[PDB]
Amino acid sequence: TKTWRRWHRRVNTTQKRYAICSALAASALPALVMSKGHRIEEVPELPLVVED
Amino acid sequence: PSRLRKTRKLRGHVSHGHGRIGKHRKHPGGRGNAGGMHHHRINFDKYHPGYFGKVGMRHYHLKRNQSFCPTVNLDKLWTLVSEQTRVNAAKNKTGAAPIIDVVRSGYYKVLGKGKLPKQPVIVKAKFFSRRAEEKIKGVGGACVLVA
Amino acid sequence: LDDLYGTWRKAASLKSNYNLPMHKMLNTDLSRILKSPEIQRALRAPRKKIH
Amino acid sequence: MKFNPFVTSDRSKNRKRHFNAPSHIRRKIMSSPLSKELRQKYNVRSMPIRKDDEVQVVRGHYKGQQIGKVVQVYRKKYVIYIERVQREKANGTTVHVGIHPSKVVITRLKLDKDRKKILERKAKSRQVGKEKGK
Amino acid sequence: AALRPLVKPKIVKKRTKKFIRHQSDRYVKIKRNWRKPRGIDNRVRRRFKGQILMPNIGYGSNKKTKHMLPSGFRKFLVHNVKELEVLLMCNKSYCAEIAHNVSSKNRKAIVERAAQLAIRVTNPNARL
Amino acid sequence: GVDIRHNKDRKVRRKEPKSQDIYLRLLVKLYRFLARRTNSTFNQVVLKRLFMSRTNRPPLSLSRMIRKMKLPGRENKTAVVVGTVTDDVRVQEVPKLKVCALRVTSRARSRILKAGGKILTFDQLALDSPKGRGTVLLSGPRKGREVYRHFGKAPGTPHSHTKPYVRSKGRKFERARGRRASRGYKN
Amino acid sequence: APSRNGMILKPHFHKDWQRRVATWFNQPARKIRRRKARQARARRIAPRPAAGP
Amino acid sequence: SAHLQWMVVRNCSSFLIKRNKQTYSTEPNNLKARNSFRYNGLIHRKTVGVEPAADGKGVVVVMKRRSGQRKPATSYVRTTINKNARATLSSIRHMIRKNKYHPDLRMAAIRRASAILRSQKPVM
RNA sequence: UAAAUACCGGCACGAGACCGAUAGUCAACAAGUACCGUAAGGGAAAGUUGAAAAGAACUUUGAAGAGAGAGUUCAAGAGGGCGUGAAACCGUUAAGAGGUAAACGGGUGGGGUCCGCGCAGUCCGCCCGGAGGAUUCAACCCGGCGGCCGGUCCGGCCGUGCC
RNA sequence: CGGGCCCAUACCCGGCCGUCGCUGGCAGUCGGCAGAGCGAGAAAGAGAGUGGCGCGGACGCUACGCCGCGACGAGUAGGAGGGCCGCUGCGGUGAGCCUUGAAGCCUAGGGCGCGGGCCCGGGUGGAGCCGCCGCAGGUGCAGAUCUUGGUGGUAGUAGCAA
Ligand SMILES: [Mg+2]
Ligand SMILES: [Mg+2]
Ligand SMILES: [Mg+2]
Ligand SMILES: [Mg+2]
Ligand SMILES: [Mg+2]
Ligand SMILES: [Mg+2]
Ligand SMILES: [Mg+2]
Ligand SMILES: [Mg+2]
Ligand SMILES: [Mg+2]
Ligand SMILES: [Mg+2]
Ligand SMILES: [Mg+2]
Ligand SMILES: [Mg+2]
Ligand SMILES: [Mg+2]
Ligand SMILES: [Mg+2]
Ligand SMILES: [Mg+2]
Numbered sequence A: 001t002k003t004w005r006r007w008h009r010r011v012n013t014t015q016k017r018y019a020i021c022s023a024l025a026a027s028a029l030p031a032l033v034m035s036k037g038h039r040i041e042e043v044p045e046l047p048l049v050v051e052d
Numbered sequence B: 001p002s003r004l005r006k007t008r009k010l011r012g013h014v015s016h017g018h019g020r021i022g023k024h025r026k027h028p029g030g031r032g033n034a035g036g037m038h039h040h041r042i043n044f045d046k047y048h049p050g051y052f053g054k055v056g057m058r059h060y061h062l063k064r065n066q067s068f069c070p071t072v073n074l075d076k077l078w079t080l081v082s083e084q085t086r087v088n089a090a091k092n093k094t095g096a097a098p099i100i101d102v103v104r105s106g107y108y109k110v111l112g113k114g115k116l117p118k119q120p121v122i123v124k125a126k127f128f129s130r131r132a133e134e135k136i137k138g139v140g141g142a143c144v145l146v147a
Numbered sequence C: 001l002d003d004l005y006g007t008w009r010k011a012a013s014l015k016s017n018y019n020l021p022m023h024k025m026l027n028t029d030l031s032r033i034l035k036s037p038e039i040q041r042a043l044r045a046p047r048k049k050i051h
Numbered sequence D: 001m002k003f004n005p006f007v008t009s010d011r012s013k014n015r016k017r018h019f020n021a022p023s024h025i026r027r028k029i030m031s032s033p034l035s036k037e038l039r040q041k042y043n044v045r046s047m048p049i050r051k052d053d054e055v056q057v058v059r060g061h062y063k064g065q066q067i068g069k070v071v072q073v074y075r076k077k078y079v080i081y082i083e084r085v086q087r088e089k090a091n092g093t094t095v096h097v098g099i100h101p102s103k104v105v106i107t108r109l110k111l112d113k114d115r116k117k118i119l120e121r122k123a124k125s126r127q128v129g130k131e132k133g134k
Numbered sequence E: 001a002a003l004r005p006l007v008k009p010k011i012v013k014k015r016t017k018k019f020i021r022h023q024s025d026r027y028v029k030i031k032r033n034w035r036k037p038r039g040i041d042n043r044v045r046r047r048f049k050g051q052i053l054m055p056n057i058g059y060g061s062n063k064k065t066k067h068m069l070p071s072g073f074r075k076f077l078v079h080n081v082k083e084l085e086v087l088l089m090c091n092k093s094y095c096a097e098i099a100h101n102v103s104s105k106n107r108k109a110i111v112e113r114a115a116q117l118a119i120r121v122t123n124p125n126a127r128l
Numbered sequence F: 001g002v003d004i005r006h007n008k009d010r011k012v013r014r015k016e017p018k019s020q021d022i023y024l025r026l027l028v029k030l031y032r033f034l035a036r037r038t039n040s041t042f043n044q045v046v047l048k049r050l051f052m053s054r055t056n057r058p059p060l061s062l063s064r065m066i067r068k069m070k071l072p073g074r075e076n077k078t079a080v081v082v083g084t085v086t087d088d089v090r091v092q093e094v095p096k097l098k099v100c101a102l103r104v105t106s107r108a109r110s111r112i113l114k115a116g117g118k119i120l121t122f123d124q125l126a127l128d129s130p131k132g133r134g135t136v137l138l139s140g141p142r143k144g145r146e147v148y149r150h151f152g153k154a155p156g157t158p159h160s161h162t163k164p165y166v167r168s169k170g171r172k173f174e175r176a177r178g179r180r181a182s183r184g185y186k187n
Numbered sequence G: 001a002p003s004r005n006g007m008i009l010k011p012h013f014h015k016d017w018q019r020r021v022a023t024w025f026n027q028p029a030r031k032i033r034r035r036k037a038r039q040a041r042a043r044r045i046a047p048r049p050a051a052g053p
Numbered sequence H: 001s002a003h004l005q006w007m008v009v010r011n012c013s014s015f016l017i018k019r020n021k022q023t024y025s026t027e028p029n030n031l032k033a034r035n036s037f038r039y040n041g042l043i044h045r046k047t048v049g050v051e052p053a054a055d056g057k058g059v060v061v062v063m064k065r066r067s068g069q070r071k072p073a074t075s076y077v078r079t080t081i082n083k084n085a086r087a088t089l090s091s092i093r094h095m096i097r098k099n100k101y102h103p104d105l106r107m108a109a110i111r112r113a114s115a116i117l118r119s120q121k122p123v124m
Numbered sequence I: 001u002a003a004a005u006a007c008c009g010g011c012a013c014g015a016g017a018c019c020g021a022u023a024g025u026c027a028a029c030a031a032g033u034a035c036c037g038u039a040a041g042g043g044a045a046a047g048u049u050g051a052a053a054a055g056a057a058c059u060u061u062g063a064a065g066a067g068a069g070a071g072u073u074c075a076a077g078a079g080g081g082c083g084u085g086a087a088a089c090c091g092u093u094a095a096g097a098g099g100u101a102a103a104c105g106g107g108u109g110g111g112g113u114c115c116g117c118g119c120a121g122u123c124c125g126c127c128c129g130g131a132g133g134a135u136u137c138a139a140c141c142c143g144g145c146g147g148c149c150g151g152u153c154c155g156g157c158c159g160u161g162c163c
Numbered sequence J: 001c002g003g004g005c006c007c008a009u010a011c012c013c014g015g016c017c018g019u020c021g022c023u024g025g026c027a028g029u030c031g032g033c034a035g036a037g038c039g040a041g042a043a044a045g046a047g048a049g050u051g052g053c054g055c056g057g058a059c060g061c062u063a064c065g066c067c068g069c070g071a072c073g074a075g076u077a078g079g080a081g082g083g084c085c086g087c088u089g090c091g092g093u094g095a096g097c098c099u100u101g102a103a104g105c106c107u108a109g110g111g112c113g114c115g116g117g118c119c120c121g122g123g124u125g126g127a128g129c130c131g132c133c134g135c136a137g138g139u140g141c142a143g144a145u146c147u148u149g150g151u152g153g154u155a156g157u158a159g160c161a162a
């Protein structure tokens, strides 16, 4: 093995932002959150917002 | 991902996909692209015609910066300015024509490839072609030279 | 967050040039689409007789 | 979580340091908690063990409520010997059973000037810490 | 009174012997785990008369009886009590199977819950 | 003991999209149902094209779209593309168009809307016209890719205008022996 | 040996190229060091423009 | 929507058990406890769930309301039923059929109710 | 003539989708050591009792190694190259068999060691009849919750809607 | 030259397995707000209008799913597909397993899969291990007069005789 194996990868900014948007959109669905496994049953509203 | 490659499916087969009769030897044809005239000659002729020999003159100290000359076409000519300019020019009644600076945009020579909308213009270019100038005149307008 | 990632009409202001990605299909309620009058009108009768 | 970029989380490095610490670091490692009454009256939670302190055994086969006097602190093997924590050998000789100081609670300290200085230093540090915290 | 499945068809297996690796009887370094012979002169590969058979696809069992235990059920590995409500509604077709790693105190509870729920257990008195 | 050959028994066509796009799979489900339950071949062609790879559904430009929609007879119909509709810059006047496509570039969308047309998705198309009645089915130039200038009769062969694979274009790069009449032969 | 239609190439790997292979694993460290030296110089020259003359 | 959520969770959920050539889903409101679009208990606007009462007698029937989709805390209304078997079955059957509350699964609901009542019945 | 630049040696450091004692440095251990060569040079093998030595007092046969008892330990089935302890190979016990070397595939038969904790044989719903016991059914009243609506009830919010 | 008879993996009938094709069928589970259908030689409506008591109805559809029709099945060199085949490590997940006993090892025990292999039972052992979704690789041995280590038959033999 050599140290100059291609360790790192390169991703376009447009699709990185695409993935962030998709993750945020999925994080607002109780079905998806409970499928991920969080115990959000007693949470009042899923996009949980608290004051400053 | 080495788990998706052909080497994982060749485990168990004796020859690893390279045949028993003619083994996988080391360099059975020569290193690199040698033999281009003797035993790879017809490959070189059938896919690389003109690969051998000399042709033309030699230039000792070339300067791409010296030879630099970008070109634009009349098809793309009107895209170099805001379409607000085109709307105002086609709307007004005085007849004043907008000014285009292909040098400012980043072009030097203007080639005339396609249609030009019927609207008077003035083009400030470094070089012109005969047909580009003819089409600009046929639209009705001027070509000026800049340095 | 809205200012960060922009809206459908308003592009992101904290990104030099960014706007939200578009949808290839809008109505994702496939069952609602299938059992709608306009579609259900233009079908042939189902064949569910096992031969 | 540890944020100091100059101390290790390396298991091997921590084990090597612990098992190769010199004697004056062995002393610091060999610390035992004071009893409830001593802790209340000194505001100090722990004290490195000494040769002649009365202690109790809290865990193991010898756990109980008896007060035993330390005999010797065997820093090389990380164990301490108490005056009546011992078993019977084959021939009939009674040898001591080593116990780690972390499983032992101190009952009455052996006070001298330096020990008192250590106690007052620790008490002052806890007082300033509590003043800062509250 | 053991529990019965919904239906108990006559299970037919096209073969009951196992396919042993060729020439594994003559060596100890060679396990019986089947490896396909690839030799140029191998009579087993060439399918000579009276040799070891090879696992064709034509030996595949009936899909209606595939994986059915001789009791008529199909096995399901379970590790704790919460995985028996899974088989609650597959009562007559599927049995339960406690892992080897579960300890006796939990095996007792699993067996008791399964007896309550009428789910069959294939190893009900394993450790005790 | 049957005298048949099994070379071409297995067809090679695509039975499903290769992609894992969930939206594309939802569209494929919808149009599978439509093409199975109707007697219109528009749906069959549409899902055939939905199955295809990106190279087999090239982008379609506003220039081609406008020309093909301004062809006589096919007025105020809906143009359907199973590919991408892309903005064209050397066009000046955009008519009121009616477009359905998998995706439209941002500037082309702006041009179409400002002209005053409408852009649809395929589910909206299925709701508007389940049988595809009153539609114009178009597709971009399949042979616009640059790889097709390298295919065909090999170069260095008479009457073959096939581009060669050269690392760079210039005077010293593959122009002497097989290309000149002075340097031996010209094919 | 060339095979069918391809583009014949000239890789410059006939020297002892593996002896000289300059990796860039210390690139983030170099960026951090450059930025820290930049801040140090800027704070050293207290009121003067940070970008020199 | 339900179909989109199913396309997300059909193979990458935390309630999914895949062993012994069998597949199962362990979300709370899933009758028949099977990985299925129809019987999934999370992705639909309206589901039901038959669970045994914590008292150990009777069943609890869960209905999902119409308004609070994004409000998990006040989304499921629970109905505890402690009666005899036939009338419990009749009550569940009416709650489904008369309300027309996702009628695809009334038979599955009453099968689960009968199983739970049998389980609550002491063993011989 | 400083800076931006290079660094498999050295003094300290920190970390790892790395190897885990035939691996990783040759070197996890008294390793450039033992040893070999006249010399230049060549160059290994080798980790693990237990939590704690509590490392087997004492009795007895023998010159003794070595045994039989006793004892420690949770465990000697951990007894100073002692965690776990596989294969090749060997001894013994039990069973079977034995003039075409042994061995093998297909089909049966015979005998074994074990399993079923088999040995009076399944049940699940509806109806008729016989004996029993209940807070006990329908309808009605009060209260709470929920689902679908008001052709076109009043009030809100939202638009990849417009004016 | 005549009747009869014997049998191959060939041919016929039947069952099961897989592949290929029909780019076949199924969103119609439209149920008291209801009215059960699309298989039958021969195109296209269970078309709309205008005048002459008792409260009931199995399974289904991980649509990457299920179901139905036919045909087909040799294979070295070689190609491709599917692995709920196997090994080590990482990101998530299993309110996972574990001193009332993990890994590993042995097993005339019970089984599953065509197979790669896997799951239980018994014993030993004494501290850690695994399932599913993805990611990565120093990832699977019967051979190389292969490397290292150990052990056999020869064999209680040749020999211990200047
Ligand atoms: Mg082959
Ligand atoms: Mg090959
Ligand atoms: Mg060979
Ligand atoms: Mg060759
Ligand atoms: Mg080669
Ligand atoms: Mg600190
Ligand atoms: Mg041959
Ligand atoms: Mg063939
Ligand atoms: Mg072919
Ligand atoms: Mg070749
Ligand atoms: Mg770090
Ligand atoms: Mg070793
Ligand atoms: Mg080593
Ligand atoms: Mg080892
Ligand atoms: Mg190893």
Ligand SMILES: [Mg+2]
Residues within 6 Å of the ligand: I048
């Ligand atoms: Mg060892």
Ligand SMILES: [Mg+2]
Residues within 6 Å of the ligand: none
């Ligand atoms: Mg240890």
Ligand SMILES: [Mg+2]
Residues within 6 Å of the ligand: I075
């Ligand atoms: Mg033990």
Ligand SMILES: [Mg+2]
Residues within 6 Å of the ligand: I078, I083
């Ligand atoms: Mg041991």
Ligand SMILES: [Mg+2]
Residues within 6 Å of the ligand: I085
């Ligand atoms: Mg041992």
Ligand SMILES: [Mg+2]
Residues within 6 Å of the ligand: none
């Ligand atoms: Mg033996």
Ligand SMILES: [Mg+2]
Residues within 6 Å of the ligand: none
């Ligand atoms: Mg015998």
Ligand SMILES: [Mg+2]
Residues within 6 Å of the ligand: none
């Ligand atoms: Mg047949």
Ligand SMILES: [Mg+2]
Residues within 6 Å of the ligand: F001, J073
């Ligand atoms: Mg055949």
Ligand SMILES: [Mg+2]
Residues within 6 Å of the ligand: none
């Ligand atoms: Mg074949």
Ligand SMILES: [Mg+2]
Residues within 6 Å of the ligand: none
């Ligand atoms: Mg241990």
Ligand SMILES: [Mg+2]
Residues within 6 Å of the ligand: J137, J138
């Ligand atoms: Mg590795």
Ligand SMILES: [Mg+2]
Residues within 6 Å of the ligand: none
């Ligand atoms: Mg080997």
Ligand SMILES: [Mg+2]
Residues within 6 Å of the ligand: none
């Ligand atoms: Mg002799």
Ligand SMILES: [Mg+2]
Residues within 6 Å of the ligand: none
């Ligand atoms: Mg002699």
